[PDB]
Symmetry: D2
Amino acid sequence: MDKIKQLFANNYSWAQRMKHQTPHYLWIGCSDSRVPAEKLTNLEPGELFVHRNVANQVIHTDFNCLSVVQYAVDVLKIEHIIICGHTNCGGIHAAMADKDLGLINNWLLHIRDIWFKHGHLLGKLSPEKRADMLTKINVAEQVYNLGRTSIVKSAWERGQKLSLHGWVFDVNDGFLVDQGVMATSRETLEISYRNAIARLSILDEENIL
Amino acid sequence: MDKIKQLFANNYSWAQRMKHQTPHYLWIGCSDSRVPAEKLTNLEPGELFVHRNVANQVIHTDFNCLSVVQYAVDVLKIEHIIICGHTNCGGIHAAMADKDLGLINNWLLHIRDIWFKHGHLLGKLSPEKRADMLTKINVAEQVYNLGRTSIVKSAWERGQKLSLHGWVFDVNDGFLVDQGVMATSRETLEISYRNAIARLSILDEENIL
Amino acid sequence: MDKIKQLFANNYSWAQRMQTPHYLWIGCSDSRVPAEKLTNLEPGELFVHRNVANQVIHTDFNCLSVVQYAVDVLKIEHIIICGHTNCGGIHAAMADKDLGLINNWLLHIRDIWFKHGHLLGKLSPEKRADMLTKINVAEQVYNLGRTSIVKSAWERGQKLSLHGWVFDVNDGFLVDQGVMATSRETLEISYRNAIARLSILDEENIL
Amino acid sequence: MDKIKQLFANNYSWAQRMQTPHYLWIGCSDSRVPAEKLTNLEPGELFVHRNVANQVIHTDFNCLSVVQYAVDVLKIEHIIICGHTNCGGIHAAMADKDLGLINNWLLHIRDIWFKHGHLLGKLSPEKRADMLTKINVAEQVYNLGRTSIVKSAWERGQKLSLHGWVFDVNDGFLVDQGVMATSRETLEISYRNAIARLSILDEENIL
Ligand SMILES: [Zn+2]
Ligand SMILES: [Zn+2]
Ligand SMILES: [Zn+2]
Ligand SMILES: [Zn+2]
């Protein structure tokens, strides 16, 4: 409408004012996330192969995300896969609310499972800070999910060089923050994941219930 | 590695050099696509809610994409959904090749079905230009797929304002090109889709077999 | 109520009164007579997936992972897709009603309908559903034969044969629909022959 | 070969020698005795989905659309999830082997295993699979009760009851696993009671 017309005009102004690339990372981010990964990481266009979904998930049986991972790893020979969460995540907030929002809630049930898996931790935390912790923990679980896929396990098994990263983008300072799960093998995945969960579980004393 | 370290340094330099938003569009683009939609459309961060998958598909039964559409429409009350293809699409090229690339090929079978659906047209075209035409036709079919979802049909049925757009981004000039399918109702979807296919089917005489 | 209490009774009475699988069977959730009774097979002979309108959707993780497990792990050499007459899913896909989530699943059947719309448009309205049911089976064997899983099994020399039949409640006989693949070449040939044959209408069927 | 030719023979001989559905049945593809025989029901009483390890995955379009169609369209008031003993999918999920694509499907079972790892770690190794099979059924009824489809049916006042049983080949009896929901509150209560009960081990089961 007025909005579609302003989009076309903005595209035209941009194109006029401006006047092959091997991808080296697969980027899995969130549909809410507001700043684009290419801006954020200030890399040259085409360096990132990008999948975005709600709450940056790697669901075991999601054909969309799984096929993107298989194509990146087996076909494009991409050596780095990055899961990037972000602060003030609508998806995560959506997952925590009581509301039945319809079909999307079925997608967010995987986050709710991650909530209950870490319920003891999240339950010793004051209610108002749980959404920040869950965003962090979710990134860690998605890297773990990624490292458990048949695709990633097979790539590692045949000696293909492949690393998995889990970061959170904080808009309040523009920095990427490593959540500590970083895998180059099934063994490093296990140790790194367990270490990260343990580190995340040390709560700041001023919000312990 | 050297690449992850340069990413962190680039993020830091960017953040230091730099020193709430209602989304109004759902953007469905392609994982290959190299220029980001926010750059391309020069809109302010947070205006776009973004899903990217390989070859910018709306597959009937894709829970990932369908749930993003349902959340955008029913929850975020987004009034515009845009499917954006792009020139030199790896996904489309991947779909046309003979190679069994593995799991991803199952995802690209939907494009191959779109190929055979328009085979007569694509077969009267010289082989070397078919990938450009298929990229265009695919955008048109995905808008059609989108307008046929239970989610979109129900939104229109209850009088919710919602428009569907199908564009192609051409990097060779930076312009967004309307492929002509634009729906605000099931009826406009049908007419617009049929019109677009018919228009796309008029071939340039110098590459007719 | 009584309903569930009755099942436990009927079961307890049934049990009181009373194996390598070699086929993967993909049938329909509205099917009413089991494949095991239908085929009079020994229990455990069949590894069974049932879904609405006996579909092999390109990107259905549920059915694909069933296929992969049957083929790569169980080493099954026969995959049978069975449609049937008076199929509720096929009739649901042909109706114009918004049924909700299921309509998205049934859009794949509607694409097939469109694909063979000329064939179908020259048929009597009361015959069209049974024709779409037959075409559906052919199209799903075709989909199955086009999976990376099946193609990769053939490439590597594994013995695997795909079948597409329709069970008719009326007379209780399975009728072969003619798409039978032991390879990608035989898939293509038999799919195309199956459809070409379905396109030869008897005047009883013609509108 | 003879195999397929034999099926048509066995079928032709079977047919020569020889209904509103009220339940949605979610069973396992490795199940061997059909639900219809098992329950001694009339043909067409059961609307059947079978998949590997009788799962209701949150985001499985295949099973969810089956559920939605059963509930919103067919108006079925009972959804029965049936696991069984000697389940090949459960055993496959417990093994450490890369089976390929199917392993991704089975990771959901492995998450459940982890969820109840303490309960399971105190069990005899030869008993663990049958315990995971029982827990699986409870967890899937729970998943089913948490779908937007089922929750929305309850919200709006529709009569719908969820059940979770295990069929034992040994003695042929269905055994109720105790998670039975007619509402979200009764889901929570009965799920928690089911698991609490499963956590009371008999010394025969204890390692
Ligand atoms: Zn987010
Ligand atoms: Zn592309
Ligand atoms: Zn049927
Ligand atoms: Zn089983």
